[PDB]
Amino acid sequence: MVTAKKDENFSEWYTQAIVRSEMIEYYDISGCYIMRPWAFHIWEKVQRFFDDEIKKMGVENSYFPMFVSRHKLEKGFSPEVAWVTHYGDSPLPEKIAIRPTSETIMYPAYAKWIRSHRDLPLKLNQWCSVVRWEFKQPTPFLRTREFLWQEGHTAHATEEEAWELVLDILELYRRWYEECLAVPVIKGEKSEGEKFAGGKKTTTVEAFIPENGRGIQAATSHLLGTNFAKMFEIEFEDEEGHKRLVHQTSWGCTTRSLGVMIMTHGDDKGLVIPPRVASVQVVIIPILENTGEILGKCRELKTMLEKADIRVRIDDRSNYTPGWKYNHWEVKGVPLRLELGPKDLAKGTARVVRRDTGEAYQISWADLAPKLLELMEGIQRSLFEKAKARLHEGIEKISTFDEVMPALNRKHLVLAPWCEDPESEEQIKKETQKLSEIQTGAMKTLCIPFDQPPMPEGTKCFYTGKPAKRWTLWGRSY
Amino acid sequence: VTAKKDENFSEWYTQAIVRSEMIEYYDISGCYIMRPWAFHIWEKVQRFFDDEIKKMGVENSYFPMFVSRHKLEKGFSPEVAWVTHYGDSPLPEKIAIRPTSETIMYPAYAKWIRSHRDLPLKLNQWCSVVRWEFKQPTPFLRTREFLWQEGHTAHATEEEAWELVLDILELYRRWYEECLAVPVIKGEKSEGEKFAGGKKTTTVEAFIPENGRGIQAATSHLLGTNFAKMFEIEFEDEEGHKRLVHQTSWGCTTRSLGVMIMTHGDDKGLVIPPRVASVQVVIIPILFKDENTGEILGKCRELKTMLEKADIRVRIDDRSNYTPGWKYNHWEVKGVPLRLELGPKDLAKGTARVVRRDTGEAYQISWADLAPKLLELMEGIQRSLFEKAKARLHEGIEKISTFDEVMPALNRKHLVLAPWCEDPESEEQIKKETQKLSEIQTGAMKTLCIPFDQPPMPEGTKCFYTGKPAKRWTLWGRSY
Ligand SMILES: Cc1cc(N2CC[C@@](CO)(C3CC3)C2=O)cc(C(=O)NCc2cc(F)cc(-c3cnn(C)c3)c2)n1
Ligand SMILES: Cc1cc(N2CC[C@@](CO)(C3CC3)C2=O)cc(C(=O)NCc2cc(F)cc(-c3cnn(C)c3)c2)n1
Ligand SMILES: O=C(C[C@H]1NCCC[C@@H]1O)Cn1cnc2cc(Br)c(Cl)cc2c1=O
Ligand SMILES: O=C(C[C@H]1NCCC[C@@H]1O)Cn1cnc2cc(Br)c(Cl)cc2c1=O
């Protein structure tokens, strides 16, 4: 049973929810966690969605090695990578790192494979795990030392084609969150200080966690331009015979998405899993003395529902009371519970309870499959709409810096007109950190949203008083 | 490809996998890049196997890639890769990259399993593992990092665990025979060849005629209660008594792709069985001197739509910057089962010319007949690839009765099926003797498996090596 209340002790609530729902197991190596089937099935669902979509775009999957040579990674202080230095008791002549990302593994191959315009575009993806051995405190799903992800890497003859792909991928990430996970996200461009330094422009989808007021980056898609093509000599002869640099993109999204989903939809009773990704969509709980009447009808119902492609489990485990099973599956977040006891059997009905609201329905056995499909569609949409309402309520539009600290104290983000000077972003981070100290606490840019309201002529930047350029979203962050 | 498969087999294999764009080389020895053309086949067999194990109630999971020194070694270290530093700082205790996940998963199993209500526990994961052997690698077959799936189950009874071992082994037979069209032999490993941590190891074995070697294709172990004792995986039964779980584990890797390549490839390159071909039919418009360009391209689009309506996986190669002859050779070296050519004449005739990759046979087919006729041809290709490979397997196994027949059979690049007493001392002696005789003429012959399909053992039959009473017919040969 979940005892910590989500609004009062959010961090303990999160730990309880992910452990008692059987999503994670702890491990002796800090920063690494076991992903149990209840969570892994959600990853499998989003992976299938995204993989099907990128295949429609002509992206093909591949698999590159998990190791990169020291001289290829460092193309005098090491990055925060895990170094393999020995095989058995024998030192390697040159240490090798576990991939933190695969640019330095893939791009030498791209340089070999690309020789002429005929070879472009080149569009590859891989599903793997990466390792980033940061010394800070980990958080399951959200910030871990090893994590599962997909990384896409493309090369094109023109920047326009590369940018088109950047935006198509970002739209797929919006769909991953909004359509599969029912989590609303905001598409935007990263500031110069926050973008990937190896690239030209970084686009992002950002999510908001109301309980701690923090934004979190949900996925990323980069227009790399020609920087990496210069560094790796990825050149092609054009249709007229001149050597040119390719224009590249890269993009990724991780199991952080599951953590965002958990935090968005969970409640005081535990998880709430959107029907589109739930391992089990309907749990059948026989109200049981096993004559065979009740479980016979349950097996018939499960067969029937599975013909409608509903993911069903009958919980016929012994020595647990019905109420125990009800709470067990509520903590796990199954979106629908189907109760079948003796009175139900006598009437030819079943009692269906939806997890998000607790509303109960008496449904005849015949109406079961269509009514349950309808209810799952309603649950999915209601989860999304309520989360989107909370997102809207969490963003305050401001004009001057003196509004910032009140908004941050309300656990809100701010949308502010900004001159986009990177010096000013560093100054704002320092000032908000120190104001929080006197009163991390730093506010930073989350993104410059694609959806720009008009910028009235003469609008001043909320911090510098210089002419504002764009409306920018700021907040405390992960 | 220019090397002949029947002359320089290793060189043929390297040319086949490079020129088909299946692999790319890499600067760290023993690791290779799996390019999209190879990864497509992997995706097909992964989907088959994952669908089937899900039907059995096995659920996917993901455990960490790292194992602490004290948990792995629960002296001289094993052939694992050791992480010793994060950045410039030494780890307080070094950690290994997984070579397999027993030591990572089983402490969790011990925590999770409390009563019979928790059993059976059936988990699988798709991942890569690392085995840092000092020997020469071979792409797909023997590499230092490789992709695989490892399944690990726990049961209340040995009977249930053994039933699962055999169900999984049958899935591996289907992975090879139904998907890859590679015939395999199910069997039990000898005492000297089985997984030491388990009670009985079952296997599927394939045969490579060009070098006379058996190769283990996949494995499924009855672990019994050994790991349950080691990791304290116990459960309370219905009577309230504490008992040990009965476990299984099982795995299969991208070695399967290399076995497919070696089995079906020919002097022209790869031959992909239709059931694992991401492109089953390639349509090639013959464009020359601007003769009917628009008509030909429109018709190719129509044909692709029609064939896709029949679930045939079709690609039109309308790339303007390659000639038709180049396209012919490209898709042939890549092993696409069927090539469909449509030129000006064919547009006039209402026909298309189709060539099958395995035999080269050509067919003129009316556009209306295309879908059913191509389905029929793909069934024929899949069946023929399997049947020819099975005939080669049959021809490569000699039944023997005495050790004096062994060296002539090995020199014919064959396996031997011999009656054996099953004494491990005798397997060790046979390995040494056959290596020595080979040297005089690696060359050691070992057991590959004791097949499930046992012919009768006539009373009084003597072991082919020791002269003691034979127990079972055993398959032996040179091996990978
Ligand atoms: C699961 C995951 C996802 C992502 N990212 C980033 C990119 C993105 C965006 O969505 C996606 C690929 C594109 C994503 O998912 C980043 C990390 C991560 O930085 N891990 C290392 C680590 C370990 C640790 F023990 C502690 C901390 C730590 C503690 N405090 N701070 C400030 C850091 C960090 N981890
Ligand atoms: C791809 C793959 C698959 C399997 N196995 C084994 C089990 C099985 C059976 O099918 C499946 C999981 C159950 C499978 O696929 C074993 C290896 C492997 O031993 N790698 C290490 C290595 C690296 C290296 F550079 C050289 C050598 C080397 C050279 N000569 N010798 C005698 C060894 C070995 N590799
Ligand atoms: O990983 C990236 C850039 C992009 N790679 C492709 C997938 C999407 C992703 O945003 C940025 N990044 C992030 N963290 C890193 C940590 C280390 Br350690 C190293 Cl060496 C390198 C990096 C590093 O390059
Ligand atoms: O890996 C195994 C046994 C089984 N594990 C589950 C998947 C199927 C597989 O056959 C045997 N094995 C093989 N090679 C190994 C190499 C090293 Br290095 C280590 Cl430490 C351990 C092992 C080791 O245990």
Side-chain angles (χ1 to χ4, degrees), chain B residues 30 131 133 135-138 140-144 146 148 216-219 251-255 480:
Chain B
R131 297 178 182 185
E133 294 211 28
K135 313 183 201 193
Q136 181 187 309
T138 298
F140 296 116
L141 305 180
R142 297 188 297 209
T143 62
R144 287 172 167 176
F146 51 93
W148 85 348
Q216 182 176 43
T219 197
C252 186
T253 81
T254 41
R255 167 179 288 187
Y480 277 83

PDB file of all heavy atoms in Angstrom, chain B residues 30 131 133 135-138 140-144 146 148 216-219 251-255 480, ligand 2:
ATOM      1  N   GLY B  30      37.702  -7.701 -32.319  1.00  0.00           N
ATOM      2  CA  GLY B  30      36.665  -8.599 -31.864  1.00  0.00           C
ATOM      3  C   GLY B  30      35.277  -8.001 -31.813  1.00  0.00           C
ATOM      4  O   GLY B  30      34.336  -8.690 -31.407  1.00  0.00           O
ATOM      5  N   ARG B 131      32.509 -11.110 -23.890  1.00  0.00           N
ATOM      6  CA  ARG B 131      33.404 -12.192 -23.487  1.00  0.00           C
ATOM      7  C   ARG B 131      34.731 -11.925 -24.174  1.00  0.00           C
ATOM      8  O   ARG B 131      34.853 -12.114 -25.389  1.00  0.00           O
ATOM      9  CB  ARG B 131      32.825 -13.536 -23.907  1.00  0.00           C
ATOM     10  CG  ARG B 131      31.506 -13.813 -23.206  1.00  0.00           C
ATOM     11  CD  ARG B 131      30.881 -15.106 -23.642  1.00  0.00           C
ATOM     12  NE  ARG B 131      29.597 -15.287 -22.980  1.00  0.00           N
ATOM     13  CZ  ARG B 131      28.880 -16.390 -23.118  1.00  0.00           C
ATOM     14  NH1 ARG B 131      29.331 -17.349 -23.919  1.00  0.00           N
ATOM     15  NH2 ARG B 131      27.727 -16.525 -22.493  1.00  0.00           N
ATOM     16  N   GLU B 133      37.768 -12.850 -25.101  1.00  0.00           N
ATOM     17  CA  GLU B 133      38.694 -13.946 -25.375  1.00  0.00           C
ATOM     18  C   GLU B 133      39.860 -13.459 -26.222  1.00  0.00           C
ATOM     19  O   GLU B 133      39.695 -12.616 -27.104  1.00  0.00           O
ATOM     20  CB  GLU B 133      37.973 -15.089 -26.089  1.00  0.00           C
ATOM     21  CG  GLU B 133      36.923 -15.765 -25.233  1.00  0.00           C
ATOM     22  CD  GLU B 133      36.748 -17.238 -25.570  1.00  0.00           C
ATOM     23  OE1 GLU B 133      37.719 -17.866 -26.043  1.00  0.00           O
ATOM     24  OE2 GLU B 133      35.630 -17.760 -25.371  1.00  0.00           O
ATOM     25  N   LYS B 135      41.509 -14.962 -28.490  1.00  0.00           N
ATOM     26  CA  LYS B 135      41.670 -15.671 -29.749  1.00  0.00           C
ATOM     27  C   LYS B 135      41.115 -14.865 -30.923  1.00  0.00           C
ATOM     28  O   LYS B 135      40.482 -13.823 -30.756  1.00  0.00           O
ATOM     29  CB  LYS B 135      41.020 -17.052 -29.665  1.00  0.00           C
ATOM     30  CG  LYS B 135      41.371 -17.814 -28.396  1.00  0.00           C
ATOM     31  CD  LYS B 135      40.756 -19.200 -28.390  1.00  0.00           C
ATOM     32  CE  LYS B 135      40.652 -19.751 -26.977  1.00  0.00           C
ATOM     33  NZ  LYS B 135      40.348 -21.211 -26.975  1.00  0.00           N
ATOM     34  N   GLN B 136      41.381 -15.368 -32.125  1.00  0.00           N
ATOM     35  CA  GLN B 136      40.997 -14.662 -33.342  1.00  0.00           C
ATOM     36  C   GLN B 136      39.480 -14.650 -33.483  1.00  0.00           C
ATOM     37  O   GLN B 136      38.846 -15.712 -33.431  1.00  0.00           O
ATOM     38  CB  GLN B 136      41.617 -15.363 -34.553  1.00  0.00           C
ATOM     39  CG  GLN B 136      41.304 -14.700 -35.896  1.00  0.00           C
ATOM     40  CD  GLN B 136      41.792 -15.522 -37.080  1.00  0.00           C
ATOM     41  OE1 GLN B 136      42.951 -15.931 -37.129  1.00  0.00           O
ATOM     42  NE2 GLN B 136      40.902 -15.775 -38.035  1.00  0.00           N
ATOM     43  N   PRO B 137      38.864 -13.489 -33.663  1.00  0.00           N
ATOM     44  CA  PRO B 137      37.411 -13.433 -33.823  1.00  0.00           C
ATOM     45  C   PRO B 137      36.981 -13.749 -35.249  1.00  0.00           C
ATOM     46  O   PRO B 137      37.770 -13.711 -36.193  1.00  0.00           O
ATOM     47  CB  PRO B 137      37.081 -11.971 -33.479  1.00  0.00           C
ATOM     48  CG  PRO B 137      38.312 -11.227 -33.877  1.00  0.00           C
ATOM     49  CD  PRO B 137      39.479 -12.150 -33.636  1.00  0.00           C
ATOM     50  N   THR B 138      35.690 -14.074 -35.381  1.00  0.00           N
ATOM     51  CA  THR B 138      35.052 -14.257 -36.675  1.00  0.00           C
ATOM     52  C   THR B 138      33.719 -13.520 -36.630  1.00  0.00           C
ATOM     53  O   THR B 138      32.902 -13.799 -35.736  1.00  0.00           O
ATOM     54  CB  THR B 138      34.788 -15.737 -36.963  1.00  0.00           C
ATOM     55  OG1 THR B 138      36.026 -16.459 -37.016  1.00  0.00           O
ATOM     56  CG2 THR B 138      34.033 -15.876 -38.290  1.00  0.00           C
ATOM     57  N   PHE B 140      30.010 -12.434 -36.637  1.00  0.00           N
ATOM     58  CA  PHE B 140      28.797 -13.174 -36.283  1.00  0.00           C
ATOM     59  C   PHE B 140      29.050 -14.404 -35.411  1.00  0.00           C
ATOM     60  O   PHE B 140      28.345 -14.597 -34.419  1.00  0.00           O
ATOM     61  CB  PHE B 140      27.953 -13.560 -37.503  1.00  0.00           C
ATOM     62  CG  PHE B 140      27.394 -12.383 -38.245  1.00  0.00           C
ATOM     63  CD1 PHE B 140      27.776 -12.136 -39.550  1.00  0.00           C
ATOM     64  CD2 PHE B 140      26.501 -11.518 -37.624  1.00  0.00           C
ATOM     65  CE1 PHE B 140      27.271 -11.027 -40.237  1.00  0.00           C
ATOM     66  CE2 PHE B 140      25.990 -10.410 -38.308  1.00  0.00           C
ATOM     67  CZ  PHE B 140      26.373 -10.180 -39.611  1.00  0.00           C
ATOM     68  N   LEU B 141      30.066 -15.203 -35.737  1.00  0.00           N
ATOM     69  CA  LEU B 141      30.183 -16.529 -35.131  1.00  0.00           C
ATOM     70  C   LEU B 141      30.837 -16.496 -33.753  1.00  0.00           C
ATOM     71  O   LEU B 141      30.377 -17.181 -32.829  1.00  0.00           O
ATOM     72  CB  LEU B 141      30.961 -17.457 -36.066  1.00  0.00           C
ATOM     73  CG  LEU B 141      30.360 -17.528 -37.467  1.00  0.00           C
ATOM     74  CD1 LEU B 141      31.219 -18.481 -38.287  1.00  0.00           C
ATOM     75  CD2 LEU B 141      28.917 -17.981 -37.389  1.00  0.00           C
ATOM     76  N   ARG B 142      31.946 -15.770 -33.614  1.00  0.00           N
ATOM     77  CA  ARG B 142      32.710 -15.721 -32.361  1.00  0.00           C
ATOM     78  C   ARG B 142      33.259 -14.304 -32.219  1.00  0.00           C
ATOM     79  O   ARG B 142      34.245 -13.935 -32.872  1.00  0.00           O
ATOM     80  CB  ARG B 142      33.823 -16.782 -32.324  1.00  0.00           C
ATOM     81  CG  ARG B 142      33.332 -18.260 -32.364  1.00  0.00           C
ATOM     82  CD  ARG B 142      34.441 -19.310 -32.125  1.00  0.00           C
ATOM     83  NE  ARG B 142      35.461 -19.264 -33.170  1.00  0.00           N
ATOM     84  CZ  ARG B 142      36.194 -20.302 -33.560  1.00  0.00           C
ATOM     85  NH1 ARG B 142      36.011 -21.504 -33.009  1.00  0.00           N
ATOM     86  NH2 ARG B 142      37.105 -20.138 -34.513  1.00  0.00           N
ATOM     87  N   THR B 143      32.604 -13.494 -31.383  1.00  0.00           N
ATOM     88  CA  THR B 143      32.978 -12.090 -31.231  1.00  0.00           C
ATOM     89  C   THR B 143      33.010 -11.725 -29.756  1.00  0.00           C
ATOM     90  O   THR B 143      32.417 -12.401 -28.911  1.00  0.00           O
ATOM     91  CB  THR B 143      32.018 -11.157 -31.989  1.00  0.00           C
ATOM     92  OG1 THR B 143      30.696 -11.300 -31.459  1.00  0.00           O
ATOM     93  CG2 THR B 143      32.009 -11.487 -33.484  1.00  0.00           C
ATOM     94  N   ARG B 144      33.707 -10.631 -29.449  1.00  0.00           N
ATOM     95  CA  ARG B 144      33.892 -10.256 -28.046  1.00  0.00           C
ATOM     96  C   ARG B 144      32.673  -9.546 -27.471  1.00  0.00           C
ATOM     97  O   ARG B 144      32.435  -9.619 -26.262  1.00  0.00           O
ATOM     98  CB  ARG B 144      35.129  -9.372 -27.885  1.00  0.00           C
ATOM     99  CG  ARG B 144      36.427 -10.145 -28.027  1.00  0.00           C
ATOM    100  CD  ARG B 144      37.583  -9.184 -28.047  1.00  0.00           C
ATOM    101  NE  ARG B 144      38.869  -9.849 -27.871  1.00  0.00           N
ATOM    102  CZ  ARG B 144      40.035  -9.210 -27.924  1.00  0.00           C
ATOM    103  NH1 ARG B 144      40.070  -7.910 -28.187  1.00  0.00           N
ATOM    104  NH2 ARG B 144      41.169  -9.871 -27.742  1.00  0.00           N
ATOM    105  N   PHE B 146      28.472  -9.366 -28.357  1.00  0.00           N
ATOM    106  CA  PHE B 146      27.429  -9.838 -29.260  1.00  0.00           C
ATOM    107  C   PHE B 146      26.054  -9.615 -28.660  1.00  0.00           C
ATOM    108  O   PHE B 146      25.885  -9.616 -27.440  1.00  0.00           O
ATOM    109  CB  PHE B 146      27.601 -11.323 -29.671  1.00  0.00           C
ATOM    110  CG  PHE B 146      27.803 -12.281 -28.515  1.00  0.00           C
ATOM    111  CD1 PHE B 146      26.721 -12.939 -27.920  1.00  0.00           C
ATOM    112  CD2 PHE B 146      29.090 -12.582 -28.073  1.00  0.00           C
ATOM    113  CE1 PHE B 146      26.927 -13.831 -26.879  1.00  0.00           C
ATOM    114  CE2 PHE B 146      29.290 -13.492 -27.039  1.00  0.00           C
ATOM    115  CZ  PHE B 146      28.203 -14.109 -26.436  1.00  0.00           C
ATOM    116  N   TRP B 148      22.217 -10.793 -27.964  1.00  0.00           N
ATOM    117  CA  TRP B 148      21.554 -12.049 -27.653  1.00  0.00           C
ATOM    118  C   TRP B 148      20.318 -11.822 -26.818  1.00  0.00           C
ATOM    119  O   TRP B 148      19.974 -10.699 -26.493  1.00  0.00           O
ATOM    120  CB  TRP B 148      22.504 -13.017 -26.923  1.00  0.00           C
ATOM    121  CG  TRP B 148      22.617 -12.878 -25.419  1.00  0.00           C
ATOM    122  CD1 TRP B 148      22.162 -11.860 -24.641  1.00  0.00           C
ATOM    123  CD2 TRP B 148      23.268 -13.794 -24.534  1.00  0.00           C
ATOM    124  NE1 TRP B 148      22.471 -12.094 -23.326  1.00  0.00           N
ATOM    125  CE2 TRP B 148      23.153 -13.276 -23.236  1.00  0.00           C
ATOM    126  CE3 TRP B 148      23.928 -15.009 -24.717  1.00  0.00           C
ATOM    127  CZ2 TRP B 148      23.677 -13.926 -22.127  1.00  0.00           C
ATOM    128  CZ3 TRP B 148      24.445 -15.651 -23.618  1.00  0.00           C
ATOM    129  CH2 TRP B 148      24.317 -15.111 -22.339  1.00  0.00           C
ATOM    130  N   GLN B 216      27.425 -24.899 -32.409  1.00  0.00           N
ATOM    131  CA  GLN B 216      26.279 -24.817 -31.517  1.00  0.00           C
ATOM    132  C   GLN B 216      25.429 -23.610 -31.882  1.00  0.00           C
ATOM    133  O   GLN B 216      25.926 -22.473 -31.902  1.00  0.00           O
ATOM    134  CB  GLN B 216      26.739 -24.721 -30.069  1.00  0.00           C
ATOM    135  CG  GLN B 216      25.558 -24.691 -29.109  1.00  0.00           C
ATOM    136  CD  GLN B 216      25.974 -24.692 -27.656  1.00  0.00           C
ATOM    137  OE1 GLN B 216      26.902 -23.991 -27.260  1.00  0.00           O
ATOM    138  NE2 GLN B 216      25.272 -25.474 -26.846  1.00  0.00           N
ATOM    139  N   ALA B 217      24.157 -23.858 -32.188  1.00  0.00           N
ATOM    140  CA  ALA B 217      23.257 -22.830 -32.700  1.00  0.00           C
ATOM    141  C   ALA B 217      22.477 -22.113 -31.603  1.00  0.00           C
ATOM    142  O   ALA B 217      22.145 -20.927 -31.766  1.00  0.00           O
ATOM    143  CB  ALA B 217      22.273 -23.465 -33.688  1.00  0.00           C
ATOM    144  N   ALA B 218      22.172 -22.784 -30.497  1.00  0.00           N
ATOM    145  CA  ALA B 218      21.434 -22.204 -29.376  1.00  0.00           C
ATOM    146  C   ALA B 218      21.432 -23.219 -28.250  1.00  0.00           C
ATOM    147  O   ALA B 218      21.711 -24.412 -28.477  1.00  0.00           O
ATOM    148  CB  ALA B 218      19.982 -21.866 -29.757  1.00  0.00           C
ATOM    149  N   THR B 219      21.088 -22.757 -27.039  1.00  0.00           N
ATOM    150  CA  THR B 219      21.191 -23.658 -25.896  1.00  0.00           C
ATOM    151  C   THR B 219      20.070 -23.424 -24.890  1.00  0.00           C
ATOM    152  O   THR B 219      19.566 -22.302 -24.733  1.00  0.00           O
ATOM    153  CB  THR B 219      22.580 -23.577 -25.246  1.00  0.00           C
ATOM    154  OG1 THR B 219      22.784 -24.714 -24.402  1.00  0.00           O
ATOM    155  CG2 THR B 219      22.704 -22.327 -24.427  1.00  0.00           C
ATOM    156  N   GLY B 251      19.651 -19.306 -24.239  1.00  0.00           N
ATOM    157  CA  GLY B 251      20.111 -18.173 -25.022  1.00  0.00           C
ATOM    158  C   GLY B 251      20.337 -18.485 -26.485  1.00  0.00           C
ATOM    159  O   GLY B 251      20.576 -19.642 -26.887  1.00  0.00           O
ATOM    160  N   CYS B 252      20.297 -17.407 -27.273  1.00  0.00           N
ATOM    161  CA  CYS B 252      20.615 -17.517 -28.698  1.00  0.00           C
ATOM    162  C   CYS B 252      21.041 -16.120 -29.153  1.00  0.00           C
ATOM    163  O   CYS B 252      20.578 -15.108 -28.604  1.00  0.00           O
ATOM    164  CB  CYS B 252      19.422 -18.031 -29.527  1.00  0.00           C
ATOM    165  SG  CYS B 252      19.615 -18.381 -31.238  1.00  0.00           S
ATOM    166  N   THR B 253      21.923 -16.081 -30.155  1.00  0.00           N
ATOM    167  CA  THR B 253      22.647 -14.840 -30.498  1.00  0.00           C
ATOM    168  C   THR B 253      22.623 -14.577 -31.999  1.00  0.00           C
ATOM    169  O   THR B 253      22.070 -15.343 -32.794  1.00  0.00           O
ATOM    170  CB  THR B 253      24.117 -14.945 -30.051  1.00  0.00           C
ATOM    171  OG1 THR B 253      24.876 -15.690 -31.016  1.00  0.00           O
ATOM    172  CG2 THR B 253      24.267 -15.592 -28.684  1.00  0.00           C
ATOM    173  N   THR B 254      23.249 -13.444 -32.393  1.00  0.00           N
ATOM    174  CA  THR B 254      23.460 -13.124 -33.805  1.00  0.00           C
ATOM    175  C   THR B 254      24.375 -14.116 -34.519  1.00  0.00           C
ATOM    176  O   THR B 254      24.525 -14.006 -35.745  1.00  0.00           O
ATOM    177  CB  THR B 254      23.990 -11.692 -33.961  1.00  0.00           C
ATOM    178  OG1 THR B 254      24.953 -11.473 -32.939  1.00  0.00           O
ATOM    179  CG2 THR B 254      22.845 -10.678 -33.815  1.00  0.00           C
ATOM    180  N   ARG B 255      24.962 -15.100 -33.805  1.00  0.00           N
ATOM    181  CA  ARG B 255      25.598 -16.217 -34.497  1.00  0.00           C
ATOM    182  C   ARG B 255      24.646 -16.845 -35.507  1.00  0.00           C
ATOM    183  O   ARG B 255      25.091 -17.330 -36.559  1.00  0.00           O
ATOM    184  CB  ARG B 255      26.050 -17.255 -33.469  1.00  0.00           C
ATOM    185  CG  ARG B 255      26.441 -18.589 -34.078  1.00  0.00           C
ATOM    186  CD  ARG B 255      26.904 -19.583 -33.015  1.00  0.00           C
ATOM    187  NE  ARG B 255      28.210 -19.235 -32.474  1.00  0.00           N
ATOM    188  CZ  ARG B 255      28.903 -20.005 -31.639  1.00  0.00           C
ATOM    189  NH1 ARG B 255      28.404 -21.186 -31.251  1.00  0.00           N
ATOM    190  NH2 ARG B 255      30.086 -19.603 -31.197  1.00  0.00           N
ATOM    191  N   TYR B 480      33.272 -25.521 -33.913  1.00  0.00           N
ATOM    192  CA  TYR B 480      33.618 -24.155 -33.595  1.00  0.00           C
ATOM    193  C   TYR B 480      33.725 -24.057 -32.079  1.00  0.00           C
ATOM    194  O   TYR B 480      33.527 -25.053 -31.361  1.00  0.00           O
ATOM    195  CB  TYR B 480      32.539 -23.210 -34.095  1.00  0.00           C
ATOM    196  CG  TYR B 480      32.666 -22.856 -35.551  1.00  0.00           C
ATOM    197  CD1 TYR B 480      32.161 -23.689 -36.539  1.00  0.00           C
ATOM    198  CD2 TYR B 480      33.269 -21.668 -35.939  1.00  0.00           C
ATOM    199  CE1 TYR B 480      32.260 -23.358 -37.871  1.00  0.00           C
ATOM    200  CE2 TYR B 480      33.377 -21.332 -37.268  1.00  0.00           C
ATOM    201  CZ  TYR B 480      32.870 -22.176 -38.230  1.00  0.00           C
ATOM    202  OH  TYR B 480      32.959 -21.859 -39.565  1.00  0.00           O
TER     203      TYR B 480
HETATM  204  C1  LIG C   2      28.865 -14.439 -31.214  1.00  0.00           C
HETATM  205  C2  LIG C   2      29.188 -15.496 -30.195  1.00  0.00           C
HETATM  206  C3  LIG C   2      28.263 -16.481 -29.846  1.00  0.00           C
HETATM  207  C4  LIG C   2      28.633 -17.462 -28.915  1.00  0.00           C
HETATM  208  N1  LIG C   2      27.718 -18.464 -28.459  1.00  0.00           N
HETATM  209  C5  LIG C   2      28.128 -19.429 -27.432  1.00  0.00           C
HETATM  210  C6  LIG C   2      26.800 -19.903 -26.843  1.00  0.00           C
HETATM  211  C7  LIG C   2      25.781 -19.726 -27.989  1.00  0.00           C
HETATM  212  C8  LIG C   2      25.589 -21.057 -28.733  1.00  0.00           C
HETATM  213  O1  LIG C   2      24.888 -20.826 -29.944  1.00  0.00           O
HETATM  214  C9  LIG C   2      24.445 -19.133 -27.536  1.00  0.00           C
HETATM  215  C10 LIG C   2      24.297 -18.223 -26.349  1.00  0.00           C
HETATM  216  C11 LIG C   2      23.862 -19.652 -26.253  1.00  0.00           C
HETATM  217  C12 LIG C   2      26.442 -18.665 -28.882  1.00  0.00           C
HETATM  218  O2  LIG C   2      25.931 -18.106 -29.832  1.00  0.00           O
HETATM  219  C13 LIG C   2      29.908 -17.428 -28.384  1.00  0.00           C
HETATM  220  C14 LIG C   2      30.757 -16.406 -28.772  1.00  0.00           C
HETATM  221  C15 LIG C   2      32.115 -16.335 -28.136  1.00  0.00           C
HETATM  222  O3  LIG C   2      32.612 -17.327 -27.602  1.00  0.00           O
HETATM  223  N2  LIG C   2      32.696 -15.134 -28.138  1.00  0.00           N
HETATM  224  C16 LIG C   2      33.978 -14.909 -27.486  1.00  0.00           C
HETATM  225  C17 LIG C   2      35.145 -15.030 -28.436  1.00  0.00           C
HETATM  226  C18 LIG C   2      35.692 -13.890 -29.008  1.00  0.00           C
HETATM  227  C19 LIG C   2      36.712 -14.031 -29.909  1.00  0.00           C
HETATM  228  F1  LIG C   2      37.264 -12.904 -30.428  1.00  0.00           F
HETATM  229  C20 LIG C   2      37.222 -15.245 -30.293  1.00  0.00           C
HETATM  230  C21 LIG C   2      36.682 -16.392 -29.718  1.00  0.00           C
HETATM  231  C22 LIG C   2      37.218 -17.728 -30.073  1.00  0.00           C
HETATM  232  C23 LIG C   2      38.107 -18.083 -31.097  1.00  0.00           C
HETATM  233  N3  LIG C   2      38.321 -19.390 -31.136  1.00  0.00           N
HETATM  234  N4  LIG C   2      37.562 -19.886 -30.133  1.00  0.00           N
HETATM  235  C24 LIG C   2      37.527 -21.320 -29.882  1.00  0.00           C
HETATM  236  C25 LIG C   2      36.891 -18.926 -29.481  1.00  0.00           C
HETATM  237  C26 LIG C   2      35.655 -16.278 -28.781  1.00  0.00           C
HETATM  238  N5  LIG C   2      30.419 -15.453 -29.654  1.00  0.00           N
END
